[PDB]
Structures are given as C-alpha cells and as structure tokens.
Amino acid sequence: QISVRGLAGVENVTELKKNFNRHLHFTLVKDRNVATPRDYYFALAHTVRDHLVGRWIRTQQHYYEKDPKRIYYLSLEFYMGRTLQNTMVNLALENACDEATYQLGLDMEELEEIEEDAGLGNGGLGRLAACFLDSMATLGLAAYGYGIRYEFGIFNQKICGGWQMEEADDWLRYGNPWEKARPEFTLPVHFYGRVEHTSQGAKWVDTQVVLAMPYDTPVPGYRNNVVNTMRLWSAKAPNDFNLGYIQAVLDRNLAENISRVLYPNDNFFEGKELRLKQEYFVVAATLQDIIRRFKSSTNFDAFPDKVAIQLNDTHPSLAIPELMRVLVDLERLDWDKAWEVTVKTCAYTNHTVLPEALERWPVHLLETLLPRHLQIIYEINQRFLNRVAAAFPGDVDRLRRMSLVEEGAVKRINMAHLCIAGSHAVNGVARIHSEILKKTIFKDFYELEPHKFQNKTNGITPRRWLVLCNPGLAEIIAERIGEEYISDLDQLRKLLSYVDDEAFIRDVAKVKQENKLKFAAYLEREYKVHINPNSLFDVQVKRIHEYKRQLLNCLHVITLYNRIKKEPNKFVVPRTVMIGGKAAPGYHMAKMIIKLITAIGDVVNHDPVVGDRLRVIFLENYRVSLAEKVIPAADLSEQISTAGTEASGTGNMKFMLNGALTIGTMDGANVEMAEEAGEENFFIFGMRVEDVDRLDQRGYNAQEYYDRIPELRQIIEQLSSGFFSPKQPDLFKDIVNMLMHHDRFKVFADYEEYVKCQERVSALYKNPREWTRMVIRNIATSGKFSSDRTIAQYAREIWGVEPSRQRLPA
Amino acid sequence: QISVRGLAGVENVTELKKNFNRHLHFTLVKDRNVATPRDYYFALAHTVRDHLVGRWIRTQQHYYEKDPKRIYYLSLEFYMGRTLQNTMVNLALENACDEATYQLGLDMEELEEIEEDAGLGNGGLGRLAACFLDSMATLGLAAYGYGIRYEFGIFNQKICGGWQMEEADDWLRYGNPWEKARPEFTLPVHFYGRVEHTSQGAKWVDTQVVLAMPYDTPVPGYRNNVVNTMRLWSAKAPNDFNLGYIQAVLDRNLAENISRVLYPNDNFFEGKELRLKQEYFVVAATLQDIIRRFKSSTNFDAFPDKVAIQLNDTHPSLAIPELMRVLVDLERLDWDKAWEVTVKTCAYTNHTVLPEALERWPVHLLETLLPRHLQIIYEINQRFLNRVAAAFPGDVDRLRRMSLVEEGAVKRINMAHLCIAGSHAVNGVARIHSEILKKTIFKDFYELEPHKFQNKTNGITPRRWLVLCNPGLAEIIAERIGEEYISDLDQLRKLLSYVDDEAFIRDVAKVKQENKLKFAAYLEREYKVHINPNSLFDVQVKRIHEYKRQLLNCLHVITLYNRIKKEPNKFVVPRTVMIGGKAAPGYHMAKMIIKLITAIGDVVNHDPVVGDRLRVIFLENYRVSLAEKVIPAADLSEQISTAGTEASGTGNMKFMLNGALTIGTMDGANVEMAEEAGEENFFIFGMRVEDVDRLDQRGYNAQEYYDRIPELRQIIEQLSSGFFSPKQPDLFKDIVNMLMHHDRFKVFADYEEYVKCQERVSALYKNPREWTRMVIRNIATSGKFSSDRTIAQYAREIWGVEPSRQRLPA
Numbered sequence A, B: 001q002i003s004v005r006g007l008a009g010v011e012n013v014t015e016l017k018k019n020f021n022r023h024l025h026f027t028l029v030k031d032r033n034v035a036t037p038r039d040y041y042f043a044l045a046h047t048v049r050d051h052l053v054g055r056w057i058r059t060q061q062h063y064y065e066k067d068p069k070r071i072y073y074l075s076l077e078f079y080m081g082r083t084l085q086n087t088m089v090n091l092a093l094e095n096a097c098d099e100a101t102y103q104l105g106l107d108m109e110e111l112e113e114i115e116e117d118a119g120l121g122n123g124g125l126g127r128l129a130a131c132f133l134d135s136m137a138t139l140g141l142a143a144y145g146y147g148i149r150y151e152f153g154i155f156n157q158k159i160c161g162g163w164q165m166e167e168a169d170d171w172l173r174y175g176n177p178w179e180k181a182r183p184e185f186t187l188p189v190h191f192y193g194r195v196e197h198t199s200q201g202a203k204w205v206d207t208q209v210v211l212a213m214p215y216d217t218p219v220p221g222y223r224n225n226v227v228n229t230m231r232l233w234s235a236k237a238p239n240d241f242n243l244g245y246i247q248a249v250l251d252r253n254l255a256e257n258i259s260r261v262l263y264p265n266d267n268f269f270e271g272k273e274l275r276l277k278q279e280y281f282v283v284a285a286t287l288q289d290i291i292r293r294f295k296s297s298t299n300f301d302a303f304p305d306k307v308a309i310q311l312n313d314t315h316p317s318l319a320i321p322e323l324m325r326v327l328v329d330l331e332r333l334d335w336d337k338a339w340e341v342t343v344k345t346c347a348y349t350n351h352t353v354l355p356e357a358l359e360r361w362p363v364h365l366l367e368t369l370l371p372r373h374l375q376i377i378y379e380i381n382q383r384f385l386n387r388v389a390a391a392f393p394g395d396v397d398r399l400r401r402m403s404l405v406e407e408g409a410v411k412r413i414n415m416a417h418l419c420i421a422g423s424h425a426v427n428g429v430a431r432i433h434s435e436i437l438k439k440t441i442f443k444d445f446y447e448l449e450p451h452k453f454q455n456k457t458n459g460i461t462p463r464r465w466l467v468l469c470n471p472g473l474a475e476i477i478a479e480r481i482g483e484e485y486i487s488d489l490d491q492l493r494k495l496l497s498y499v500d501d502e503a504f505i506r507d508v509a510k511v512k513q514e515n516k517l518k519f520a521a522y523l524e525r526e527y528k529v530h531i532n533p534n535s536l537f538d539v540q541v542k543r544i545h546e547y548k549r550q551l552l553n554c555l556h557v558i559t560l561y562n563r564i565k566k567e568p569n570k571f572v573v574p575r576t577v578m579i580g581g582k583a584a585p586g587y588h589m590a591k592m593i594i595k596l597i598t599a600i601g602d603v604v605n606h607d608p609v610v611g612d613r614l615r616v617i618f619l620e621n622y623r624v625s626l627a628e629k630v631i632p633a634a635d636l637s638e639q640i641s642t643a644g645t646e647a648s649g650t651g652n653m654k655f656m657l658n659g660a661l662t663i664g665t666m667d668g669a670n671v672e673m674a675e676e677a678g679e680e681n682f683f684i685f686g687m688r689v690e691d692v693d694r695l696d697q698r699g700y701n702a703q704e705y706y707d708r709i710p711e712l713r714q715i716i717e718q719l720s721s722g723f724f725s726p727k728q729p730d731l732f733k734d735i736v737n738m739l740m741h742h743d744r745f746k747v748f749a750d751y752e753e754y755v756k757c758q759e760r761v762s763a764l765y766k767n768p769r770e771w772t773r774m775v776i777r778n779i780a781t782s783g784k785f786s787s788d789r790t791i792a793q794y795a796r797e798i799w800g801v802e803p804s805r806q807r808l809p810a
C-alpha cells in the first residue's frame, strides 16, 4: 500500500502464507475452523519470529569472532511495548505480512491489537532504555540490555467512580513468543550470610542462594541485519531449598518473589527490602555474565577496553561494589588496581534532581542483606574522603556533604555519591539538567572532578515513534526527501524548503485530520465516548506528578469553562482536552488529581450551554501502545513542569516529531527543542529557573496570587465549596490546602502567563494554514532528538566505541 | 536394527533429519557448534511431536462429529514417566528416528536419558491411570484423563548416611515439549462463601474464585492413529485478586499453591485443607468441561448415555455432590431425577482395605470450604439411610455403620460410603480384593445393592512394559509368533509350544543375561557400585510400606549372611539382592526400614568372607524410568505382602511379563497370576487370608516365633545389640519393638515358610535350563494381565461402550 513499509514480492508473500499455516497447525495445534483472532496473532508472531533467528545467531557469533568492546546497559526497567509491528518494520516485512494476511482473509491491524504490551517500566526512564536498545542495534554496537523479567509489569489502570484502581498486569498469561528461555545459563546469586576474615583476605559465607535464569529477547536494528540481545533474569529457588515437606516446597515462593512484580513508585524512594533484593539480583547475575564473556575471548588491565557498564540511574549502583568484590575477593587483585578497572568500566546517568527520589539505603538493611558490600562501600568512602581532604584541606563541611555515608537518626548510604565516586562519567539528560547538576546537588563533586561531568540530551527512536505509529506522515515525508531520514533524522531539515509548498501543507494537515478521525473512532468503539474531531486536540499524557503540574492544566480547563458560562454566545475555538497517566499507588495527591480531572469532566461534558465546544477526557491506562495512538492525533502538546524539575522529558519529543505544537515552560529538553525550532515556533511561557530561584529566596506566597487574580479566586472558591463534588463538598480540600499553603511547584505563579499563552494557541489554530506551516517548522527541526544521535554521543564520548550503519550479510 | 521397532525408509529418515535441523535452528535457536545433548533431545522431541499433531486434531474432530459416549477418567495422579520413546513406539517411528539420529552422529538412547519423568503419582494407583490411558487410546475409546498439573511431582530421593532425603522434583525446569497450554479454556472454581436460600432454591454466594487453566497432553494409541487427550489443570489467580499493592500481587501465590505439589503420603490419610482444595479443584473444573461438551452436541435424561465418569479411588469423590449441585442448583432439575443421572454416570474403584488409608473428611473443613456440598451430602445421607431402614427395618446398628456421616469426637464424612451410594458400579482391582470388599468393609452395602459390586483385575500396558523396556525379548517373541501379540497379549499362549525348543530356551536366557549385563554397567557408571552379573538378581521394588514387608526380605538377607558366616566354605547360589522404593516423608517406620537396608548392605558388602556371593543394594530414587531398567534385568520378583493387604499389585505383572520368576504370598493379583501360570511354576509361600484370620482370632504373639526359631532369635539379638550399627547400638530399637509387640503384618509368622521357599528358588537357579523353561511358562501365560483386557472389561461391564482395534485414516 505505502512505500516506507517495504516490498510485497510474490515469493515472500507465498512463503509467509505457508509458514503462517504451518504454525497454526504444528505450533498452535488448531485448524481454521476453531481458530480465534488470538490464534491468528500467535501464528503471525511465530512466522515473523522465524525471520529473526538466522540474523540473531550470526550477529552473536560475529561478536564472539571479532571480539569488539561490549556495551552493557543495566536497568531495572525496559518499557518495550508491543514487538510485532516493530519487528516487521525493522526487517522490512510489513507490506509483505499485510498482503499475506489479507490473502488469508485477515486484517493485520486487528491482529496487532491482540499483543500485550511488555510493560516492564514506569515511564520515561524505562522507555529511554527501550529506545536506546533500538538505536544501539541500528548503530551496529555490540550492546546488551540486562534487567529483570517481571511476572507482572506496570499495573493496568481502571477508573471506577472517578478513582484509579490498580489491577495486576498478567502479561505472560497467553505466553510470550518473543522470549527464549535459557535455563542452561542459570547462575547463583547470594544473599545474607556473614563475612569471614582469613589469611587470604575476606570470605562471604553462610549465604542463602537464589538462582537467576535468563530469558533472551531479540533486538533488531533497522534494516542492517543486526539483532542484539536483551537478557532478563527470572528468580528460581534451588532444588534443595528449605530441604514439613509440603511447606518447604511452598516456601520456594519466597525466593521467586524477587522477580514477581515491578515497583510502581516513580515519585518517592522507599527503602523496601524486596526492592533492594531486586537491585542486587540483576547486578550479581549480570556481572557473572560479563566476566564469563570477558574470559572467553587472567589480565584485568584490558577489562575496561572490552567492557562498558552503563547504569540507568542509581538502581543498579550495586554494580560498583559487586565488581570490586569479585575483583578483590575472587580474582585476588589489589584494591587500587581493581578500583582503577571499576572506575574506567562504569558510567552513571542521573534522571532527577528531586531529593525525595534519590536512593538512600539504610545501613542496617545493607548490613543484614549484603554484609560484604557494606564493608566495601565503607572502604570506598574512606579512600574517597581522603582525596577530598587532600584537595580541600580544612574544609570539614565539604567532607560531610560529600560522604557516601549520611549521618542522622538512621545512617544511610547515598547511592548517587557512590555512583559518582565509582564512575569515569556522570551525565544528565538535557543541557539545562546537566548544568543544574554541576551548580547544585553535585557541585562539590564537580569541583573535585570536573572532567567526569557530561551532558547527553535524551532522544526517541524514529522507528517506533514515527514510522510505526504514524505511517501516513512517514510516507508524505518520504515522497519528498526519500527514506534515508529514518536512520538519519537530521535529514528532516530538508523539509524547511517545503514550508511554502501548497501541496505539502495540505498533505501534512490531511495526515493529522486522518489521525484525529482514527483516534476519535477508537474512543467510541473501546470506551463509548463521543468527541468532535474538528476541535483542537489538547493533550497531556505522562505519569501523574505534582511537578508535572497536571493541576495547572486543570486550572486552565476550569477557566475556559467559566469564561464560556459567563459569555455563552461568544465564539471560542473548540477543544478536546485529554489528560492521561498512571499514579503511583501510594501517592495520595496524584490519586486526588485523577479524581479532580474526572470530576471536572463530569460537570463540563454534561453542560448543555457548553455543547461540543469543550470536552474533558481522562485517558485510561496510558501506556506505550496507547501513546502510539494518541500522539499522532495530537494538535497541542502540554509540557508544563515547573522550571528546573523535569530533567528532560521524552514525550515532548514524540509530539514534536508527530506534528503537534508545544506549549511549555523552559524546562528539560523543551529548552533545546525551542532552540532547534526557533522560539517563534514554540509556545513558551512562565518562570525560568532563575525566576523560580528568586521566588524561593523571597518566599513563595500563594495567597498573593489568589488575592490579585479574580478568575483564580473563583476557581478556588468553586473547588472549596463543592461545585465539582455536590455530594461530598469537601472532597478536594487537600488539593486546595496544598495549593494555598504548601505548593512546592508554584502552580499559581505560572497561571496568568499560561492562560495568556493558551489564548495565543487558540488564535493560531483559527488560521489552519499558519498553524500547519509552524508544524512543518517543528517536524523539520526535530532531528536532534533521535536516540541515534544520543547513542552516538554515548558511544564516542563515554564508551569509547565507533558506531556504523554498515550491514551484516543477510 | 530389530523388526518390532518398525521401518527405516529412505524418505522418512531424510524427512526426520531435516525437521530435526529445523527445530534446532528455529525452535531452540542454536547451531551445531554450541548445542549440548539436552538441545539435541529437545530437537528430537519437537520432531516426533510434529507427527502427533494431525492425528490429534483429527481424532478430536472425529469425536465431535460422531458424538460417541465419552469416558472421563478422574484421578489426582497420573504417573506417566518419559514420553519420547513411548510416542515413537506407538507411531512406529523408533527405527527411523534411530537411523536419522545415527546419521547426524548422535546416539538416540543417550538422548532418551535426558528426558525427565513426569512423576505425577506415588506408585501403583498413579501408574494404573497411565497404563489405562494407553489402553483406552489403543482400544479406540473416546477417553479423557483429567487431573492436576503439579509443578512438583513425587520428590527425588537422595540417600545420605543411609537415610532418605527428599528434594523437590522440578520437572518443568527445562520445559515440557509434550504439553499444550490452553489458556483460552480457563474456567473458574469457587471456594468458601455461604449458602443463601431464595424462593428459587439455594444459591452459593460470596465465594473466592481460583482459575483453572488446562494443559493438554496427547495420548497416542498403538499404531491405530488415535490420539486422545490428558487434560491437567493448573491453578491461576484472577487479575483483581486481593485488588498494599505489592503485597496483593505477592498474595496471588496463595491461590496458585493449589497445583504446586503432589502429596507424597500414600500410607495414611491426613485431613489437610490444601489437599481438599486440590480434590475439589480438579472435580469442579473437569465437570464444567464435561457439561460444556455434552451441551455442544437441555435434556439431561441422555447424560448417562453420553457420559461415564470413573473415580480413581475416593480422591475425586466430590464429583458426586458437585454433579448434584450443578444439576439441582444451576440446571433446576428435581432432586430424584438429578440423583438418577448422577448414579448412572459415576463409578468408583477402590484400591485398599486398610482403614488408615480411607478418606474421612472432618465436617468442619467441608463446612468452611464447601458449605453447599456439605448440605448436599447430608441430604444424600438422609435419603440413603431411609432406603436402608426400609430394607432392614429395626436394624439400628446397620444405620450407623452405613451412614456417610461418622459420629465421634470430630464428625467426619466417609468418602467411600459416599462413592458407593452415588455410583452404579463399585469395583476392586483383583478377584481376592473384590471378594474381601463384599465380605468385610463393604458387606452392608453389598447386602443392600449386590448388583453394584464388581471385579476388574488390574493390568499393565505391554507397550511400555515389554516393547519399550525390553526390545530384545519382544523381538525373539515376534520371530516365533509375529507382532500381533503387542495389542493382543493373549497370543503369548502360543509360546507354550516352544517350552522344549532348544533355540528358544537359549534365546530367552541370552536376552536376560544381556539385560543383566546392561543394568550391571548402569550401576557402575551412574552410582559407582560393583555387582556380579552371574548372580541371581533378587529384586523388591515398590513404595516402602509395612504391609509390603520389605522387613521380611531383610530378615531373609540376614539369614543368608549368618549361614555363610557359619559355614563359609560351603557353596551357595550367589545373589544380588536389590531393594528400592520411596518412603512417604512422615512415615517414620518406613524411613527406619530404608536405614536398615543400607545398614545391612554396609556390613554384608564389606565382609571379605562373603566375597561376591551376597550383595545388598538399595536402589535410590525408584521411579518409572528406573523400573523400565531394573525389571527386564530381574530373575526373582519379591511380592511378599501379608495375605489380604495388597489389593492387586502391578509391579508383579511387569516382572512376570519380563522373564522373572515370582516368590509371593497368595495376595492380590498374585493369586490369579499363579492360577494362569500354574501353581507349580510359582514360588508360593505363607499364610493365606484364612490363616491370617485364624491367627487374629487367637491373638498374634510374636514372642512364640522368637522362642521357637533359633535363627530368628539370632537376627533379633543382632538388631538389638547394635551389630548393624556399632556407633548407635540402639538405632533399630523401634523396629525390634514393633516386630516383637505390635506387628500388624505378622512378619515372624511367615518367616520359616519364606526361608524354605527361598531355598527352593536357589535350587532351581542351579539348573539354568529348568529355570528358563519355567520362565517361558510364566511369560506365555501373562496375557490376562494386559491393561487392554482390563479396559475392555470396564468398557463392556461398567461404561457400556464397545472397544475396537480399527484404524483411523492417517
């Protein structure tokens, strides 16, 4: 049908059809007469999966032969989404499979909807790991993703009476065709025990053993025949575990609980023992694999030349003392040499400056669970603080500020300080964020070792986030500039010469309209809600956090409603305001915000005077597969975090690539986005970081804004009096109290500028031609935000390896 | 190589080789360079598995079209063993696969040793279900086996310091290629709750729900292209289960524990709640399947014409009140009509007369877990006792004896009485056992309803228990009488005309010698123990129970040892005495017996004066795959239970088919075996049932035997004084105390006759020609003990269906 989806040759189509029928019969044990749509999905999945095998075996044997430097990306989260369409895209099989299934009397898009998301992450950090794997494979790097195979990923969100309910994400129920179990490569992981000091150094003894069983998932590069591996560990009890009899067998669950469920708290660090076990589990098993592979090529001098370990946040920070443990205790290397190797091997990426999110493990937990690692941490700390004292003699306060050990009621280990000490590179994820790191929370470390600190601005893969989710846009772009931009997104700059092209303007606007029509139909079919497809699609999708300020969006929505009620017969640009995202289960305020959004919707959507001029919809169960649907349909992207709080954002980039304009603060990657597109092509508002700082020094008084802005006062009165909850008039008292007395994120301070900026958005939307021209200027300058660019910078500036777009033989 | 293993045609061999290579590549994702023997096993397994698919689909669709009466065999145990060789045998693929693998440079027998046993049973009852499935498929019956997919089967037995240790049987660790998960056919099972009485009858409400997910395993008939299904249920938590958040997800384990582990207690009934849950779980899920299939053909009059349910012991006895529940509560049938349907549908098989093994569930457990079923049981009981009162007016003691409710400190439900009341047929498993049922424990029920009581003497499948495990014997038999005996074992009678045939005598003896050589080599390679292959292989393998009297065997062994020590320079027939079997983990005496056997071995095997004239070996981890090795190697089969205690035995039949002579009491199927072969061709000794009865009336005094038999006294003195345990002289005091003061099984009473009979065995073994001639007379008359005969009797006399050896189209 469309060019970017590849060739549908007679020979390929015939072959796909017969392999489909073979799998239906031999693999699924069904015949056409009782087969369901799910059976058909699995037959297709197995058929496409077959095409990965040869490339996967030969990629991995190629690495064994050529022995390049290996990149190990350690993460507790890999937010992969669906795999079927992505595999077809990267293998150039999409049109062929579409034709093959059409000829068998099936709709491939319907079959694609059956696949469960691999929801093994919370949001941005987990999705970044997924985009990175795609880019590393596309750039021909010998890269491995290592994590945990959670039996249950991020919870499915149900909305009941306006409240979030959580249910288990049983994503493995029907099986996972994309994983290959490797029980033969099972490895032991140790917990508890005690440290014994012999003549020949320390020994960790009397441990409890949990087995780590790997499951391998292929990661195909874009049309380069490279297939890398994501290896995820599953927890298994040893066979003599607890070995009255029946209870001992049932107690195996205790060991296997390690890989049972993803922790869904993305707001606040909680020192839970099970989480600590997960963190060590992934680290201990992974490092054995790394070392095995390094030995199968005595001398650890060459270790950093052959191995890079990237830590996705501090979550796998135990890699640093674990590497030291193995090198010192098992390999008998001297401390200083082991430390040199460790530092040159490890690099650390930070994802937030919010103090409550930083990992600070109680010493008493580490003492019980990992006694040897605590000893090693103490020794790392002593040697590090000796270096600080020599560099800054007499600066006693610096010593306590930089210590890996935090003093207080409970002693804690600062995992971020551990990561900086033990890594040769530390990076933030957007230019402003990396600057904030050097000026604020890690200032002392930057002064000691300035060379360690880098920036690596985030990116997204243009495969999933353009070609897969928005084929209509990919095609109209390809018609003008060819197909090379898919693996070289900078080429989108060529589209600037089409900003005055009448055909292209019309095509861009047509693709958006079709996407909006498709999404409007999806909302009725799956959720029974009606929307006007001619309205401006105003979208804020991301996890629910106070710093992300969904509340500020709520205030604007109520303002528009109140303005309509005040002057009903005046014209306003119709809007469909869509807010979606999950709240961490223990985050009370976030759960209240969800309830507020639905409550606003209940009043607004049923007011006859409003009509179809304003609609407020909460998008339930926001996840990767839903993002692929809503983002192509969006007109306006809400990126409205308080300046200095959102480290980067990546959703922002997805919307820019897909033809939405952005209303945003100068925060995270928004700054660089506006810089690329031009500030005149961006809807920028609000305090800058400097203005926030000035307000903090003076003290933030919300009452001032309430007193001086009548429209804001009205909203607060409505909230307080029970206008949005007639049967429970005090329902939103917590929200009001927070806004008035303890708002860390200064919602009121940005309100006026936000409302004014929103008026400028509505004004431009009235001029479809000028709206679309500005859209073209955004799409054309989105190239920097490809994760291919990001990964190439990691490769060259941190890992010390060269990327290549060169094909492996098919 | 050998004829009975089928053809190895050029076309088949070429096809098997390429499909093997395809699976290695596409299914296992390996290449020849890093593939291990386990990978090669799985490639072969998948290759053979492919050949089952077409036949499986067409057998099941054939049943849907022809709508025959369906047989449902309900069991908590299916002791299947390995599947690969059995599948090859039944499909006539063995020689072809042997050649195919040979040409790829592999040894198929080595690959076969990699497969784990499916150890989903304890012993005879579980293995009977497995033999029955094979025979039902071979006789073309529309039969389904329904049970539980235990994650852990019967424990692996390790011997440490002479003691049994149990470890988890993690049989699913590497995957199971023989099962097909059917998550789409998941069904709900209800527990707890309460009973509500409305105008429209009773309702069971406020229940907890556990999901039952089926896994299907193919059961191929012998070369008839029939492939039946064994459906095993796995427990799954519903997605809103317990739905702080983390704990709720981890608590899903509580629901899923239902199918976690097989209960290994085969001696003593224990009223454990988890076991009750298992029993209802299998029954509730199975009955929904039965009813669904019956409806997919309103009128339940025809239900018994289309459905037979066979209860393997009382373990699935809840089927009776569950069927009543569904018919009365859900389908709205009147009680009397539902009861008529239930009785005509169900039949019950008893496997023991020992009172401690009978299921007697505390009322308080049923009240909490299954409140509606308890109400139904009470109602069944009232109506049943009304019938008894009308038949035997004024007989008040009969009423309390026959009641399903047992009075006492704790009220209990007698599940056996429930089964008799609710079944149209009740059978024992050997003629003497069925007679004992009618004369003793079920006498009252027999007097009320004599027509219900039947005999169905047990059998074993000649596929697994001759062709598979003893191909050498199968071949020499086939050379003389052809191949038809494999599915018509009565044809073995033709071998009587070869009893004086010199060539055949030599061939029978040669096959035995080769089997003994092969097993002697196995013992050295896998267990590092040396044996004389020229000695008489004296074998007792079965679960360790007091009634089975492994202790009597022990007494004989010590007698031979003491006789040798008394007259060292006298000639005795050399013996290798092999005892093997698992003890239930909580059965203290059985664990002591194992320790005694190893302790005897420790003294006997290291006495220089003994030499290689006597060896005592405990066969560790006795299971189906080990039985297939040891049984073909045996010369003497020990079947020495106290008369009236072993309901049938089936091991006895396996040994008879494989060319061993039997030393046994007139117990269980031994009686019929001796009747078939002729008493002159059997080594019969000891008390008959009548003699045991006479001894009980008088009172059994063990002291009498101790006082009057000097050789017995010596052994007891040796045991008491610490001759077999020098460092713990009182180790065996429990054994001695039991033998002297509370032996339910009269070990001393059979001692003299047993020892004398053993002398007659040794005498015959000195004459190899006459030994072998008697062996031929045994093999020739073993035909009755085919499970094909057993199943044909069930079919005709209980289920009301005709068997057929007719092929389905390939």
Ligand SMILES: O=C(NC(=O)c1ccc2ccccc2c1)N[C@@H]1O[C@H](CO)[C@@H](O)[C@H](O)[C@H]1O
Pocket (backbone or CB within 6 Å): A026, A027, A028, A029, A174, A175, A176, A177, A178, B049, B050, B052, B053, B177, B178, B179, B180, B181, B217, B218
């Ligand atoms: O589709 C599957 N088919 C079988 O296991 C299968 C196929 C044919 C069979 C023929 C005879 C007997 C068993 C069979 C099982 N298995 C599924 O494979 C998935 C992807 O590898 C895996 O995730 C599932 O756990 C498994 O059920």
Ligand SMILES: O=C(NC(=O)c1ccc2ccccc2c1)N[C@@H]1O[C@H](CO)[C@@H](O)[C@H](O)[C@H]1O
Pocket (backbone or CB within 6 Å): A122, A123, A124, A125, A126, A128, A265, A266, A267, A268, A269, A270, A351, A352, A356, A357, A358, A429, A458, A646, A647, A648, A649, A650, A668
């Ligand atoms: O998603 C993020 N964090 C999490 O999901 C997360 C996960 C586990 C946590 C555990 C304890 C405390 C905070 C946690 C946050 N961070 C986001 O990372 C993106 C990728 O760099 C970035 O664009 C966002 O600005 C950042 O908030």
Ligand SMILES: O=C(NC(=O)c1ccc2ccccc2c1)N[C@@H]1O[C@H](CO)[C@@H](O)[C@H](O)[C@H]1O
Pocket (backbone or CB within 6 Å): A049, A050, A052, A053, A177, A178, A179, A180, A181, A217, A218, B026, B027, B028, B029, B174, B175, B176, B177, B178
């Ligand atoms: O052998 C298996 N292979 C795969 O799952 C497989 C094969 C090829 C693949 C290619 C690319 C990505 C994943 C793949 C998985 N799976 C096993 O199938 C068994 C039998 O059906 C089942 O019991 C095991 O659970 C499963 O690991």
Ligand SMILES: O=C(NC(=O)c1ccc2ccccc2c1)N[C@@H]1O[C@H](CO)[C@@H](O)[C@H](O)[C@H]1O
Pocket (backbone or CB within 6 Å): B122, B123, B124, B125, B126, B128, B265, B266, B267, B268, B269, B270, B351, B352, B356, B357, B358, B429, B458, B646, B647, B648, B649, B650, B668
């Ligand atoms: O194996 C048997 N029983 C068990 O394994 C078993 C299983 C679970 C139990 C639970 C509670 C009490 C006893 C149990 C026995 N019985 C044997 O059945 C054979 C087949 O009919 C028969 O040949 C044997 O004589 C009988 O002991």
Ligand SMILES: O=c1[nH]cnc2c1ncn2[C@@H]1O[C@H](COP(=O)(O)O)[C@@H](O)[C@H]1O
Pocket (backbone or CB within 6 Å): A057, A060, A061, A064, A293, A296, B033, B034
């Ligand atoms: O010992 C070896 N001999 C030959 N090939 C090997 C060996 N070790 C690893 N390989 C190849 O490297 C691939 C990946 O190995 P892994 O990354 O260590 O798991 C395998 O699939 C093999 O093709």
Ligand SMILES: O=c1[nH]cnc2c1ncn2[C@@H]1O[C@H](COP(=O)(O)O)[C@@H](O)[C@H]1O
Pocket (backbone or CB within 6 Å): A033, A034, B057, B060, B061, B064, B293, B296
């Ligand atoms: O609804 C039906 N239409 C056609 N075939 C069916 C239908 N129901 C069952 N079958 C056939 O019967 C087989 C076994 O079904 P089951 O025993 O009910 O699980 C299936 O594999 C089908 O081939």
Ligand SMILES: *Cc1c(COP(=O)(O)O)cnc(C)c1O
Pocket (backbone or CB within 6 Å): A122, A123, A124, A127, A541, A542, A543, A622, A623, A624, A627, A648, A649, A650, A651, A652, A654
């Ligand atoms: C991209 C993405 C995110 C990250 O969005 P931000 O707006 O950067 O927080 C979160 N969830 C999903 C499902 C995503 O795809």
Ligand SMILES: *Cc1c(COP(=O)(O)O)cnc(C)c1O
Pocket (backbone or CB within 6 Å): B122, B123, B124, B127, B541, B542, B543, B622, B623, B624, B627, B648, B649, B650, B651, B652, B654
């Ligand atoms: C046949 C068999 C049994 C039954 O043996 P009996 O001697 O009849 O108790 C027990 N276990 C296994 C593994 C068997 O094969």
